[PDB]
Amino acid sequence: AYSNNSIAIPTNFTISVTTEILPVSMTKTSVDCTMYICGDSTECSNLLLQYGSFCTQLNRALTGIAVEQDKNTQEVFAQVKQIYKTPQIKDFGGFNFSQILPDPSKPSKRSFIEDLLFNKVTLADAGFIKQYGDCLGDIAARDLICAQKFNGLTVLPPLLTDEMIAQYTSALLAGTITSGWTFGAGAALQIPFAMQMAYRFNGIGVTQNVLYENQKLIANQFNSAIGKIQDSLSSTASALGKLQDVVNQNAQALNTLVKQLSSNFGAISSVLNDILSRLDPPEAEVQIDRLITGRLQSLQTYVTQQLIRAAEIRASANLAATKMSECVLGQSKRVDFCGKGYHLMSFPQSAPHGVVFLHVTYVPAQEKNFTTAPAICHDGKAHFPREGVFVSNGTHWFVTQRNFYEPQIITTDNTFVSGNCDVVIGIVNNTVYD
Amino acid sequence: FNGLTVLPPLLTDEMIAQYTSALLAGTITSGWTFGAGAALQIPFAMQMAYRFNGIGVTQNVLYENQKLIANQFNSAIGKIQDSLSSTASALGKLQDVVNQNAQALNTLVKQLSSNFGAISSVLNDILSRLDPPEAEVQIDRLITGRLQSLQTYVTQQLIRAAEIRASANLAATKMSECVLGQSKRVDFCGKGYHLMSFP
Amino acid sequence: QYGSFCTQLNRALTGIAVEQDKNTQEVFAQVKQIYKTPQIKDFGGFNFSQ
Amino acid sequence: LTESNKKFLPFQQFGRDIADTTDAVRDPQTLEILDITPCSFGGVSVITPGTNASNQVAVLYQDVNCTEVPVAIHADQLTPTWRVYSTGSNVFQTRAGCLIGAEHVNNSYECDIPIGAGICASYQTSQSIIAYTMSLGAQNSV
Ligand SMILES: *[C@@H]1O[C@H](CO)[C@@H](O)[C@H](O)[C@H]1NC(C)=O
Ligand SMILES: *[C@@H]1O[C@H](CO)[C@@H](O)[C@H](O)[C@H]1NC(C)=O
Ligand SMILES: *[C@@H]1O[C@H](CO)[C@@H](O)[C@H](O)[C@H]1NC(C)=O
Ligand SMILES: *[C@@H]1O[C@H](CO)[C@@H](O)[C@H](O)[C@H]1NC(C)=O
Ligand SMILES: *[C@@H]1O[C@H](CO)[C@@H](O)[C@H](O)[C@H]1NC(C)=O
Ligand SMILES: *[C@@H]1O[C@H](CO)[C@@H](O)[C@H](O)[C@H]1NC(C)=O
Ligand SMILES: *[C@@H]1O[C@H](CO)[C@@H](O)[C@H](O)[C@H]1NC(C)=O
Ligand SMILES: *[C@@H]1O[C@H](CO)[C@@H](O)[C@H](O)[C@H]1NC(C)=O
Ligand SMILES: *[C@@H]1O[C@H](CO)[C@@H](O)[C@H](O)[C@H]1NC(C)=O
Ligand SMILES: *[C@@H]1O[C@H](CO)[C@@H](O)[C@H](O)[C@H]1NC(C)=O
Ligand SMILES: *[C@@H]1O[C@H](CO)[C@@H](O)[C@H](O)[C@H]1NC(C)=O
């Protein structure tokens, strides 16, 4: 409902907490050059020796990918090298952080929401276990992991354990709740939490008296938002599609690489054993060469897709690092970067091969239309407000701030004089008491 | 006829135009308020005064010189329209993307005539002249070549898709920051002191 | 007799198409409320007809 | 070749694996099922300082507990000066396999050579290879 003399000013507000999930790293893998192609065969290894440095390049690329995965994790989570511990007190002016602060009861010092997130990913760490005792004498055939292990494909463990990542996140949380943004620019400087919230309110353009007068309501809204986030996490399971997608893609790539070993590639048989069993060597070289070419093309395809996926994950990790540095270590004025609305704060939470951000924002709730004028005329002078807008309650004229309806009587401190009343368009007549 | 097809986009151009029209109406009738929540009405001159305060110039400068600024804006829009209607090389990027994709597809089609070391590139006149166990060698050579061509095409497509994804992410950030608000980043929403953007 | 060579190509092309649609949606679907152009054009001398 | 618990069909002779590999074979003379395992163990990493520094190395065996390290790597039919790295004295067990050839210390330093699962190796003073838990940083409080 657009008009040239009508404005709408919000009266209430809502404190909303949103979730953002960003993949940070993927699984690191290694491939045996000889045991995948010519597994346990001196003749085939001798033939493979005539292909030069084909697989050294593959090993180099995979090593670079693993190194960059560790680097991505370090850049995302190691912003601060000082490990602040959670204070013994919880007097944060009515704010309840028990759902995100670490819980010493668990064997891994993780919070409730972190436990939910780590239990929401159905991966079971298939690369782990299988400690060369599981692939031993048993009635059943080999699993999908023993097949990879016996054909030269391995998974390297990450440098940082989940407990160390949890410690980093806990230090970040303690710093951001006990010092504000000061711990990112240097030494951590203590400040009561309500004062920090007032500073953020001033940052978003709302005077801190709004926070001070309505502290209890804001604290209750924050607690309810955290509870709703926890309930949503504990109910649904499709919010973590990205991390599960990365894990599934990597596992599918490895499984396809294993299952490609049964292709004939134009030879008499895909089994290397029953070529040297039936064919004399100089006749067997042709079949062995065809098999070598096919199995060497498979590895190149796998490595190329791995490099592309690594580039995508590196971009995601860079975005996550920027988000941490800007939303968590400070207050961001970029729109739609740290949550929809006016950004207040963010809280980091660790996830399997990823990070989770709890953005806290300020949203106006109920608007009310009013009549507004660009300027107020007086005895040969025009008046404009220093900070705020002019609003009339049908009979009187007041000045009020932008994002919260708080009318004030027009005095000399509110408005400044510039020019005369004829130049300005829409300037209305009203009295300005001193 | 050789198995290569083009899938239509999910969103038609009319739906995209509707989205852009909604964005324009919101940004001209409410300011930046419609991005952070409910759209709140405000007269346009007051919104321009708010932007002037954002760039560090007192709003009385806008109020006193409203007509001149409006005329300058109209003249700038007219000059932009004339420049668009005169030249044609300003849209090199989109035409470049279209040409690259079309050239890739055309090269993939034209690669079907390569012999790849076989007697003939035509599959029909190998099974016509050679008995099957002897024809298997030629068929295998042709299969290997035509399977390598597809892999090269797919790898190039993946790299181009990554580049386009980066460009789309930049476009989304530009929309959110320049259109849904006022940006203080230098040289991000135009050279100078940013006021507004229109998609 | 060449195994799953082309299933991977199909998977990659499908992912590319899906991400193209996702790119368009992320760029253009920021707001889900379709505001219509006002009947008035009294924008204080500014001309948006073009 | 080892003894197998797998059951073959009465007329079967070979057993095939998922990746078209021979798993178990029935002995023609004594009708028993023997499973076939490759004698090449994948997952051996060599931790070394530069060749200009020294020649000492520490070997890491992935996903193996050091009780069955000599069995896994077939240390019986191996040359000397490799059987030293199979059954040693500086045996340390980590979550990323277990490391042989490096002395374990309880002092936490900054990471020098990342091994995995929070364990890093370094070459320090005479000189020897030490392995330790990496340090995230200096403890602090507000
Ligand atoms: C614009 O404001 C003038 C007064 O300055 C008023 O007469 C006119 O009706 C307004 N325009 C509309 C469309 O209401
Ligand atoms: C704002 O909303 C809360 C929650 O409904 C309510 O308790 C409070 O009275 C409202 N404030 C105003 C000024 O309407
Ligand atoms: C914080 O919430 C938990 C459960 O949500 C509750 O047990 C605890 O008492 C709350 N904190 C305070 C100070 O009431
Ligand atoms: C304020 O008034 C305008 C015009 O009279 C109307 O279109 C608009 O809906 C009103 N606002 C509310 C919140 O009712
Ligand atoms: C607008 O608010 C003022 C402030 O109390 C009041 O005196 C005045 O009567 C109100 N106007 C109307 C029309 O209610
Ligand atoms: C305010 O002053 C102007 C000239 O200074 C005059 O035209 C107008 O009528 C006055 N308004 C009222 C309500 O007296
Ligand atoms: C806006 O420009 C068009 C052509 O550029 C013109 O026809 C129209 O009259 C202009 N608007 C006004 C209000 O004059
Ligand atoms: C084969 O002959 C050997 C030697 O006499 C004997 O030990 C073995 O039991 C025989 N196996 C069968 C299946 O007859
Ligand atoms: C190894 O490199 C260092 C580094 O300069 C050098 O001082 C040393 O002489 C080198 N060792 C040999 C044996 O050359
Ligand atoms: C195998 O490794 C585990 C480590 O989880 C260890 O507890 C166990 O004792 C080892 N096996 C033997 C036979 O010692
Ligand atoms: C290091 O800690 C282990 C485990 O407590 C202990 O057995 C060992 O003696 C310690 N080393 C030294 C030098 O004290």
Side-chain angles (χ1 to χ4, degrees):
Chain A
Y2 175 75
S3 148
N4 66 1
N5 42 30
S6 173
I7 211 168
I9 302 292
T11 308
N12 222 356
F13 48 77
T14 84
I15 300 271
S16 66
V17 168
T18 81
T19 317
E20 190 172 11
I21 291 100
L22 290 168
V24 179
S25 94
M26 63 195 216
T27 70
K28 322 190 291 164
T29 49
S30 162
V31 175
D32 212 311
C33 165
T34 321
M35 201 174 37
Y36 177 79
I37 291 147
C38 291
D40 265 328
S41 172
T42 301
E43 317 95 299
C44 202
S45 90
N46 189 37
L47 268 173
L48 184 54
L49 254 47
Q50 312 309 315
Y51 266 72
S53 65
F54 261 49
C55 52
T56 316
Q57 325 196 241
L58 314 172
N59 283 325
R60 272 195 289 257
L62 294 175
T63 310
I65 290 166
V67 166
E68 81 166 60
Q69 296 317 296
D70 277 333
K71 196 212 170 170
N72 290 332
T73 308
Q74 212 88 47
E75 302 210 321
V76 169
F77 280 101
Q79 302 265 261
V80 287
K81 298 322 278 282
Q82 281 248 302
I83 315 301
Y84 307 104
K85 77 161 40 187
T86 51
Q88 80 277 27
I89 204 56
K90 295 296 158 59
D91 177 69
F92 301 123
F95 288 75
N96 202 3
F97 296 121
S98 65
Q99 300 291 280
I100 61 174
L101 283 174
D103 206 338
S105 77
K106 300 296 169 181
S108 50
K109 298 331 158 177
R110 294 204 249 118
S111 85
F112 210 106
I113 293 181
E114 288 185 310
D115 291 7
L116 260 56
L117 295 162
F118 283 80
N119 272 260
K120 206 159 304 306
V121 174
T122 89
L123 88 167
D125 193 13
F128 202 24
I129 311 105
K130 214 67 63 153
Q131 54 271 6
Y132 230 72
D134 307 22
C135 314
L136 269 196
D138 44 11
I139 167 173
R142 314 181 171 141
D143 310 334
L144 260 175
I145 309 270
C146 298
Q148 302 171 11
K149 204 178 273 315
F150 279 175
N151 291 283
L153 318 167
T154 36
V155 179
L156 309 183
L159 175 58
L160 277 196
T161 55
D162 272 326
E163 290 82 2
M164 292 146 99
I165 293 150
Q167 284 177 238
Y168 270 129
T169 57
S170 279
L172 286 156
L173 271 165
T176 193
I177 72 181
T178 48
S179 47
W181 52 53
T182 61
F183 91 108
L189 310 181
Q190 72 216 250
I191 181 185
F193 197 66
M195 300 217 180
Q196 196 203 135
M197 274 310 268
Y199 283 40
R200 317 256 200 201
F201 259 57
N202 258 316
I204 84 169
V206 177
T207 325
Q208 79 198 8
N209 60 353
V210 172
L211 174 96
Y212 279 136
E213 292 189 9
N214 311 329
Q215 196 178 318
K216 277 161 211 312
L217 171 43
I218 293 167
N220 285 344
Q221 285 198 58
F222 178 80
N223 297 333
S224 183
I226 288 289
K228 269 227 172 162
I229 275 302
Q230 177 196 39
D231 283 3
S232 182
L233 266 175
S234 198
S235 304
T236 198
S238 51
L240 268 84
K242 317 194 100 206
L243 317 175
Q244 193 68 67
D245 222 354
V246 170
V247 175
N248 294 2
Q249 246 165 101
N250 269 251
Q252 183 84 320
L254 260 194
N255 293 348
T256 286
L257 195 57
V258 191
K259 256 166 24 186
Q260 280 238 27
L261 274 186
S262 62
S263 320
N264 290 46
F265 294 115
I268 46 159
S269 197
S270 79
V271 171
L272 212 64
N273 270 14
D274 61 36
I275 282 172
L276 316 158
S277 313
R278 289 156 79 189
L279 292 176
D280 81 281
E283 180 38 359
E285 320 305 300
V286 169
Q287 326 294 287
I288 303 297
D289 277 348
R290 278 179 213 156
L291 270 201
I292 287 186
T293 300
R295 284 173 185 175
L296 205 41
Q297 185 74 61
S298 305
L299 288 174
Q300 293 257 16
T301 305
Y302 170 79
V303 168
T304 308
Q305 323 284 290
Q306 279 296 98
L307 280 164
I308 295 167
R309 284 182 182 111
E312 266 145 32
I313 291 293
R314 164 92 171 131
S316 191
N318 270 328
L319 176 61
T322 299
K323 287 229 173 205
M324 176 98 67
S325 306
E326 277 186 38
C327 319
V328 179
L329 258 52
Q331 187 182 42
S332 190
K333 286 180 213 256
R334 291 164 74 187
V335 182
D336 283 17
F337 189 62
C338 312
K340 202 141 190 71
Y342 304 91
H343 174 241
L344 286 172
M345 38 184 46
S346 297
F347 302 119
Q349 302 282 270
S350 34
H353 281 153
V355 76
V356 171
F357 285 111
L358 298 179
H359 303 300
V360 189
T361 43
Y362 171 98
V363 170
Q366 47 199 19
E367 49 261 59
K368 209 177 317 291
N369 58 14
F370 285 109
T371 305
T372 171
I376 310 301
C377 187
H378 214 236
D379 48 287
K381 51 190 73 208
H383 285 252
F384 314 88
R386 272 153 179 71
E387 203 145 31
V389 82
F390 279 131
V391 155
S392 66
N393 209 40
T395 45
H396 293 157
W397 273 97
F398 303 84
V399 75
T400 192
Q401 50 178 285
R402 274 201 221 161
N403 303 283
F404 201 76
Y405 180 62
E406 201 66 280
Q408 309 219 290
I409 270 168
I410 298 176
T411 70
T412 278
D413 316 74
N414 287 115
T415 84
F416 59 93
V417 160
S418 323
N420 38 12
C421 293
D422 44 20
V423 47
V424 172
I425 310 167
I427 171 162
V428 307
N429 190 323
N430 179 300
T431 173
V432 179
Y433 149 79
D434 167 69
Chain B
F1 280 175
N2 291 283
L4 318 166
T5 36
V6 179
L7 309 184
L10 175 58
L11 277 197
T12 66
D13 272 326
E14 289 82 3
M15 311 185 108
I16 293 150
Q18 284 177 238
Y19 270 129
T20 57
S21 280
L23 286 155
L24 270 165
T27 193
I28 72 180
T29 48
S30 48
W32 52 53
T33 61
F34 90 108
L40 310 181
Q41 72 217 251
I42 182 185
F44 197 66
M46 302 216 197
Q47 197 203 136
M48 283 306 295
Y50 282 27
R51 317 256 199 202
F52 259 57
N53 258 316
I55 84 153
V57 177
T58 325
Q59 79 198 9
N60 60 353
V61 172
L62 171 83
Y63 280 136
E64 292 190 9
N65 311 329
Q66 196 178 318
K67 280 149 197 327
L68 163 50
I69 293 167
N71 285 344
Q72 285 199 58
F73 178 81
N74 298 334
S75 183
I77 288 289
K79 268 227 172 162
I80 275 302
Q81 177 196 39
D82 283 3
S83 182
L84 266 175
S85 198
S86 304
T87 198
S89 51
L91 276 82
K93 317 194 100 206
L94 318 175
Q95 193 68 66
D96 220 353
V97 170
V98 175
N99 294 2
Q100 247 171 100
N101 269 251
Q103 183 84 320
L105 260 194
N106 293 349
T107 286
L108 195 57
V109 192
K110 256 166 24 186
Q111 279 239 28
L112 274 186
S113 62
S114 320
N115 295 37
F116 294 116
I119 46 158
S120 197
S121 79
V122 171
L123 212 64
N124 269 15
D125 59 37
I126 282 172
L127 315 158
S128 313
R129 289 156 79 190
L130 293 176
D131 80 271
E134 169 39 0
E136 288 206 10
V137 168
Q138 327 294 287
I139 303 297
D140 277 348
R141 278 180 213 157
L142 270 201
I143 287 186
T144 300
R146 285 172 185 175
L147 204 41
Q148 186 74 60
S149 305
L150 288 174
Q151 293 257 16
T152 305
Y153 170 79
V154 167
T155 308
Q156 293 273 10
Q157 280 295 97
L158 280 164
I159 295 167
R160 284 181 182 110
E163 266 145 32
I164 291 293
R165 160 95 172 138
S167 191
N169 270 328
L170 176 61
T173 298
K174 288 229 173 205
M175 173 94 77
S176 306
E177 277 186 38
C178 319
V179 179
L180 258 52
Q182 188 182 42
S183 190
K184 286 181 213 256
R185 291 163 75 188
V186 182
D187 285 7
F188 189 62
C189 312
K191 202 141 190 71
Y193 304 91
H194 174 241
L195 286 172
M196 38 183 45
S197 297
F198 303 119
Chain C
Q1 264 75 72
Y2 266 71
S4 65
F5 261 49
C6 52
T7 316
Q8 324 196 241
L9 314 172
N10 283 325
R11 268 189 289 240
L13 294 175
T14 310
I16 291 166
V18 166
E19 81 166 50
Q20 297 317 295
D21 277 333
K22 196 212 171 170
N23 290 332
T24 308
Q25 213 88 47
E26 300 209 323
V27 169
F28 281 101
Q30 302 264 261
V31 287
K32 305 312 290 223
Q33 280 248 302
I34 316 301
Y35 306 104
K36 76 160 40 187
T37 52
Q39 80 277 27
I40 205 56
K41 296 297 158 59
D42 177 69
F43 301 123
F46 288 75
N47 202 3
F48 296 121
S49 65
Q50 300 291 280
Chain D
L1 300 169
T2 43
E3 254 310 288
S4 185
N5 295 270
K6 298 161 69 140
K7 288 290 177 286
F8 276 1
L9 258 56
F11 292 139
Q12 200 179 355
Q13 291 290 112
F14 332 121
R16 198 74 80 203
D17 187 55
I18 275 286
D20 220 36
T21 323
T22 312
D23 252 350
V25 58
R26 163 179 278 150
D27 185 273
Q29 308 217 321
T30 74
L31 310 182
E32 47 169 5
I33 319 297
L34 304 158
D35 38 353
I36 303 152
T37 294
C39 56
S40 65
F41 174 86
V44 173
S45 312
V46 175
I47 293 99
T48 170
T51 325
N52 296 40
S54 191
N55 292 6
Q56 315 159 278
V57 298
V59 192
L60 169 77
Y61 303 93
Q62 268 264 300
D63 288 354
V64 169
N65 47 5
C66 340
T67 278
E68 71 206 10
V69 158
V71 181
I73 69 158
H74 303 103
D76 212 317
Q77 48 206 122
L78 273 198
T79 81
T81 166
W82 205 325
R83 201 176 289 113
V84 163
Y85 300 100
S86 70
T87 295
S89 71
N90 324 290
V91 182
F92 178 37
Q93 176 70 60
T94 79
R95 305 212 262 191
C98 89
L99 178 73
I100 312 188
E103 146 173 299
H104 190 30
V105 292
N106 300 318
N107 214 23
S108 288
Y109 318 93
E110 212 61 70
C111 191
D112 195 10
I113 299 176
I115 286 175
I119 303 296
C120 301
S122 196
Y123 189 63
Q124 78 109 340
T125 187
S126 163
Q127 308 272 126
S128 75
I129 300 191
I130 60 151
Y132 55 89
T133 305
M134 99 185 274
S135 182
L136 310 176
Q139 184 83 27
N140 215 87
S141 155
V142 183

